[PDB]
Write a protein that binds this ligand. Structure first.
Ligand SMILES: [Mg+2]
Ligand SMILES: [Mg+2]
Ligand SMILES: [Mg+2]
Ligand SMILES: [Mg+2]
Ligand SMILES: [Mg+2]
Ligand SMILES: [Mg+2]
Ligand SMILES: [Mg+2]
Ligand SMILES: [Mg+2]
Ligand SMILES: [Mg+2]
Ligand SMILES: [Mg+2]
Ligand SMILES: [Mg+2]
Ligand SMILES: [Mg+2]
Ligand SMILES: [Mg+2]
Ligand SMILES: [Mg+2]
Ligand SMILES: [Mg+2]
Ligand SMILES: [Mg+2]
Ligand SMILES: [Mg+2]
Ligand SMILES: [Mg+2]
Ligand SMILES: [Mg+2]
Ligand SMILES: [Mg+2]
Ligand SMILES: [Mg+2]
Ligand SMILES: [Mg+2]
Ligand SMILES: [Mg+2]
Ligand SMILES: [Mg+2]
Ligand SMILES: [Mg+2]
Ligand SMILES: [Mg+2]
Ligand SMILES: [Mg+2]
Ligand SMILES: [Mg+2]
Lengths: 117, 143, 98, 69, 128, 58
RNA sequence: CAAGUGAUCUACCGAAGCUAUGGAUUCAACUCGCGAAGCGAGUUGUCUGGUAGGGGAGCGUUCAGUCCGCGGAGAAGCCAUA
RNA sequence: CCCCGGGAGGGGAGUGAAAGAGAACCUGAAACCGUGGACUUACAAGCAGUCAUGGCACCUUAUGCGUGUUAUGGCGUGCCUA
């Protein structure tokens, strides 16, 4: 019995083409170039899934020592002094948000400045 | 879930430059313009400040630098361009000196160029932006 | 400002559901009681383990599965593609505590 | 009985090696390594110094009995 | 006017084309015909017939003729108001293609493509 | 073959990029003052043949 | 006016290394349904970069037998889809 | 039979379950060409994606949920063979 490709190739192909969506030019309408684009897209995906966590670490750090310098401290100094004070163990995420609620971050700064004199 | 501010704020500031080493006043201006000060919130947004450098003519250039510093620039022409100016030829246009330092210490991208818009340099002790009454700054932080 | 920080969270957002890594606490049965690293439950707040002398209870709401994801791995020139489905479970917890 | 419920003894039947057919297993080269390994195969008891080349001591006939311990 | 299944909605709703007319298989390339048609577009049908009288392309001809069947069909088959028509839509699409092989230097051949056109245009009572 | 030849096929985008300049200009048609039809300027009204008076047949 | 440099003291940043929380796979042991191993498992320890290459479990297409059925109030194929 | 056209072609009318079968006559994918609409682009350096966030738009596996688009930031050296 013969068993020609029939329905199968078109269906895998459409699966890739639908992954394409807003890909510029042939990247979204010709199969081979869509497939190949998605190879490099795999690369980018997995590695960024890692990276985003370095990213938000960086951003919270920026904001935290921005607030720390608002009061005459700095990230090195404020983070250490908080660490010295019965280990606060707030995440760097959480210290930022208290850089959206200044009256508290202030007291955290005075507390870090304490366990440090 | 991290906070992402909207930025109605415009923030004018008046940095004096007399006697400040150029790179140092530069770094302070570049930081204040890029954000940094205050919780930076989004890198995505140009939420930094407008700086109004004055007395840019009086910038100190500690060391031999006043006549060693050779700013260099290249015209498209393959006749030898690369013209060079002494920085003692800040007499030709002192704001360029300041404006060059700062743009070096700014990002080079689309948003960075857009940031250069926020620098206003005047070699004299005067400026026309009275309508924004800038806050004075000092020049250096303390431990 | 409530914070699911890490795995066990400690921040003042009175009265709402939020998602967490899981529990084993069947149904609403959990009623999980919580540490507290700092929350402003009345303007005032503290950290110095005085937050530990406070605690926030939370009703469990329901177990769930996160959105589907496809882990995708590739390396050039060596064949080697890898497609693999994944989604991580969670527990949704309502908050009520002091 | 259930002709649909006939079941071959597990084991016994095992699937063939389908060779070409994907980087899911045994890809480009078909288990063959990039070589002077190419279709029209040729040899089985041969290298070129041959060494099954030791000498012979030869009788032609034989005849023997059915054995009854 | 809801129906229950396809076949009855098909046997009692015949589905018409107001203002529409097509010139299938015109022997011109769609690119040029499109230049003319693009000048005609959202335009009063008088000016359509005018601009077409005075525009120097070889394709002004068939595009004019089709511009008329629209008008005709709008006013005969569809009962519209000619003093009110306009070109609500007009477009050119590709027909089949007469491929003719042609000789060339030093023995080779070559395929010339006489393109054809489907010129359709569609008129309407420009209200507002 | 053909000394100079093009390098990559040109994009669907850049090809229509060049073409932003081929749109035709419509005639500045005007209403003839006697025949009440339309005519090209500084030419003779085709419909009636008139040019202030009347020069051409029909 | 070190952002240069020799010695020295710390605090912080910093990776897919270590860690927390969750979960899956490989092998090993301990528990069970059985009547036979071993299947389905559950618990702990543990493992889990990979080219040629070896091994294991599988997905999909046509055709055939058997079962179960669907179809003009609509089959297959086609198209969109969170 | 009627309409525009020298015709070709078409629009009606009529037959038929159906003309969403009309003789370029089953389905009718894709490349490729067009029309309309949403969101968008004329200081800009680009393996064309990817992550992140804001803006705008729509709500039939679908109102925390997305889906489409987009601005800016970070990151990023096509595929295969050899
Ligand atoms: Mg890390
Ligand atoms: Mg590469
Ligand atoms: Mg290699
Ligand atoms: Mg195998
Ligand atoms: Mg080979
Ligand atoms: Mg051979
Ligand atoms: Mg009927
Ligand atoms: Mg010849
Ligand atoms: Mg690890
Ligand atoms: Mg673990
Ligand atoms: Mg285990
Ligand atoms: Mg490993
Ligand atoms: Mg492995
Ligand atoms: Mg049906
Ligand atoms: Mg069949
Ligand atoms: Mg007739
Ligand atoms: Mg006819
Ligand atoms: Mg039809
Ligand atoms: Mg049909
Ligand atoms: Mg055809
Ligand atoms: Mg025909
Ligand atoms: Mg015909
Ligand atoms: Mg049939
Ligand atoms: Mg057909
Ligand atoms: Mg338009
Ligand atoms: Mg368009
Ligand atoms: Mg612009
Ligand atoms: Mg981008």
């Amino acid at each position: 019995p013969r068993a020609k490709t029939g329905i199968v190739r078109r269906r895998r192909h459409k699966k890739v083409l639908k992954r394409a969506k807003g890909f510029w030019g042939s990247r979204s309408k010709q199969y081979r170039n869509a497939f190949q684009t998605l190879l490099n897209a795999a690369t980018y995906e997995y590695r960024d899934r890692r990276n985003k966590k370095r990213d938000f670490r960086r951003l919270w750090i920026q904001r935290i020592n921005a607030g720390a310098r608002l009061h005459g401290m700095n990230y090195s100094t404020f983070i250490n002094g908080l660490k010295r004070a019965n280990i606060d163990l707030n995440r760097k995420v959480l210290a930022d948000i208290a850089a959206r609620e200044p009256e508290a971050f202030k007291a955290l700064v005075d507390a870090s400045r304490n366990a440090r004199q | 879930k991290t906070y992402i501010p909207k930025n109605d704020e415009q923030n004018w500031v008046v940095v004096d430059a007399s006697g400040v080493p150029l790179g140092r006043l530069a770094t302070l201006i570049a930081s204040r313009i890029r954000g940094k000060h205050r919780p930076d919130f989004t890198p995505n947004m140009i939420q930094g400040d407008f700086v109004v450098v004055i007395n840019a003519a009086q910038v100190a250039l500690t060391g031999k630098k006043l006549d060693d510093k050779v700013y260099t620039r290249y015209t498209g022409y393959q006749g030898g361009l690369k013209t060079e100016t002494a920085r003692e030829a800040l007499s030709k246009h002192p704001e360029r000196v300041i404006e060059h330092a700062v743009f070096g210490m700014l990002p080079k991208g689309r948003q960075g160029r857009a940031m250069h818009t926020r620098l206003k340099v005047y070699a004299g002790e005067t400026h026309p932006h009275s309508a924004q009454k800038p806050q004075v700054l000092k020049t250096q932080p303390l431990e | 400002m409530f914070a699911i920080i890490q795995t066990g969270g400690k921040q003042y957002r009175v009265s709402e559901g939020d998602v967490i890594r899981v529990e084993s606490l069947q149904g609403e049965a959990g009623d999980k009681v919580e540490l507290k690293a700092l929350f402003v439950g009345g303007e005032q707040t503290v950290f110095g383990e005085d937050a530990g002398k406070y605690t926030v209870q939370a009703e469990v709401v329901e177990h769930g599965r996160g959105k589907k994801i496809y882990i995708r791995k590739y390396k050039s020139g060596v064949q080697y593609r890898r497609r693999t489905g994944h989604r991580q479970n969670f527990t949704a917890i309502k908050i009520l505590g002091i | 009985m259930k002709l649909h419920d006939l079941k071959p003894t597990p084991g016994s039947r095992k699937d063939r090696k389908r060779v070409g057919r994907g980087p899911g297993g045994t890809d480009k080269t078909a288990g063959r390594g990039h070589k002077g390994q190419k279709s029209r195969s040729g040899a089985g008891k041969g290298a070129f110094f041959e060494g099954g080349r030791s000498r012979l001591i030869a009788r032609l006939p034989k005849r023997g009995f059915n054995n009854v311990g | 006017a809801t129906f229950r299944n396809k076949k009855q909605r098909k046997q009692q709703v015949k589905l018409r084309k107001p203002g529409f007319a097509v010139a299938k298989y015109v022997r011109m390339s769609p690119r040029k015909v499109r230049l003319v048609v693009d000048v005609i577009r959202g335009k009063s049908v008088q000016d359509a017939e005018d601009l077409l009288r005075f525009i120097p392309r070889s394709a002004s001809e068939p595009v004019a003729k089709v511009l008329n069947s629209a008008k005709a069909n709008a006013l005969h088959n569809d009962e519209m108001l000619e003093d009110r028509l306009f070109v609500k839509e007009a477009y050119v699409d590709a027909g089949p293609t007469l491929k003719r092989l042609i000789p060339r230097a030093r023995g080779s051949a070559n395929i010339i493509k006489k393109r054809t056109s489907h010129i359709t245009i569609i008129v309407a009572e420009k209200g507002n | 073959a053909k000394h100079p030849v093009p390098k990559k096929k040109t994009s669907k985008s850049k090809r229509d990029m060049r073409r932003s300049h081929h749109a035709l200009t419509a005639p500045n048609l005007t209403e003839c003052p006697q025949c009440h039809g339309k005519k090209l300027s500084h030419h003779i009204c085709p419909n009636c043949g008139y040019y202030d008076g009347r020069q051409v047949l029909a």
